[PDB]
């Protein structure tokens, strides 16, 4: 089909041959609720590793585009904004990855969730890698489900950096994260802090506290994955300006008014399905300044954030609020 462009005017103001190349990891999260984040007031410390890392910003007021992976993920990378976004014709629209690629940024998408929901479809197939099986993911045999773990996506990223030495790079890591209903399968035993847990798919038959426990354990694993992503970036901070962005695709209902899981239409969806966490980290030397933690933000902020991270300006999102200055 056709491509309708939105950033043909886009210009990268400076190039990696004149200033430090930039290296960004964007963790595309899954099913995480803002109100179960310690930083947002949650009673449990669900992000203990992130709490110890300097330079992390937590955003307390972020609303997802929609309530499902298929709806939210393409919107996260869209130029159109939630008001004009259409899930069925996103495939015909230039998205922010298309732009950054055109401007010379090396794009990599590793996926331990499903796939990019069409976002990577215009780009060469080799730039997308499936990390849901043991063919690519070296960390799948740590649990009785043989489920591949998000941290497996970090393995061998030095190879990608070496292959693209001196270039700007954007790496998407699409998490399995807190995907349900089987929250108990989403984390290895070392993250089983809150017990007992719900261990079946009939969620309404579990004790509510056990359901919450499994969900919170899954967040601990995500805290770990993000912390290790930051550590990996840190090892490249001499040669690259390094940053990490995390946003979840949507939240999750956990029994409130008897509603479970997600995917409800936006018109009727409860707040829990759209209130998501977002984190930003950057190294001391990058000169990137986060917006105020309580800025009213949505998934619409992702595209101008990614453009700003690579010194690109596009008229379409000129004045649009981002996660960063
Ligand atoms: Zn999802």
Residue numbers in the entry: 217 to 541
Tell me what the authors wrote about this structure, in their words.
MCR-1 confers resistance by modifying the colistin target, catalyzing transfer of phosphoethanolamine (PEA) onto the glucosamine saccharide of lipid A in the bacterial outer membrane. Here we present two crystal structures of the soluble, catalytic domain of MCR-1, revealing this to be a zinc metalloprotein containing three intramolecular disulphide bonds. The two structures are essentially identical (RMSD 0.37 Å over 311 Cα atoms) and reveal an overall α-β-α fold, containing three intramolecular disulphide bonds, typical of alkaline phosphatase or sulphatase enzymes, with the N-terminus indicating the likely position of the five transmembrane helices.
To facilitate such studies, we engineered MCR-1 to lack the five transmembrane helices, generating a construct containing residues 219–541 (MCR1ΔTM) which was purified and crystallised. Phases calculated from datasets collected at or near the zinc X-ray absorption edge ultimately yielded structures for two different crystal forms in the space groups P41212 (1.75 Å resolution) and P21 (1.55 Å resolution). However, the two crystal forms differ in zinc content, with the P21 structure containing one zinc ion (Zn1), coordinated by Asp465, His466, Glu246 and Thr285 in a tetrahedral geometry, while the P41212 structure contains density for an additional, also tetrahedral, zinc site (Zn2) coordinated by His395, His478, a water molecule (Wat1) and Glu300 from a symmetry related molecule. Furthermore, the active site of the P21 structure contains electron density corresponding to the presence of a phosphate group attached to Thr285, the conserved residue believed to act as the acceptor for the PEA group during the transfer reaction. This apparent autophosphorylation was confirmed by mass spectrometry of MCR1ΔTM crystallisation samples, which showed a mixed population of proteins with a mass difference (78 Da) consistent with the presence of phosphorylated and non-phosphorylated forms. In particular, in addition to their possible roles as Zn2 ligands (P41212 structure), in the P21 structure both His395 and His478 are well positioned to interact with phosphorylated Thr285, whilst the proximity of Lys333 to Thr285 suggests a possible role for this residue in substrate (PEA) binding. Moreover, both comparisons with previous structures, and our observation of phosphorylation in one of our two structures, clearly identify Thr285 as the likely nucleophile and PEA acceptor in the catalytic mechanism. For the mono-zinc mechanism, a model containing Glu246, Thr285, Asp465 and His466, with both Glu246 and Asp465 deprotonated, provided the best agreement with the experimental crystal structure.
